Write a protein that binds this DNA or RNA. Structure first.
Ligand SMILES: [Ca+2]
Ligand SMILES: [Zn+2]
Ligand SMILES: [Zn+2]
Length: 60
DNA sequence: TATTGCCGCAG
DNA sequence: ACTGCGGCAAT
């Protein structure tokens, strides 16, 4: 009916759409171009940097 | 064909 | 607590 036609050429993992595959490929590559300005830790995109930022709040 | 914002799932 | 993951929508 649930098709996962996009797939990785090094491990065959399948995806519903091109976005999951884009992210998966970049994860194999270690391509994490956006970094936390506070600690330097790198993430795949700005959204994931932003989610990380709360690490740096004083707890509670 | 591409990238990421948004945000939920799971460990 | 923290983050890898990935579906959907938008672009
Ligand atoms: Ca999901
Ligand atoms: Zn793969
Ligand atoms: Zn940080």
């Amino acid at each position: 009916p649930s098709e996962r036609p996009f797939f990785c050429n090094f491990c065959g993992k399948t995806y519903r759409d091109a976005s999951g595959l884009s992210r998966h490929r970049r994860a194999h590559l270690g391509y994490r171009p956006r970094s936390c300005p506070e600690c330097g830790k790198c993430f795949r995109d700005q959204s994931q940097v932003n989610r990380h930022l709360k690490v740096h709040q004083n707890k509670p």
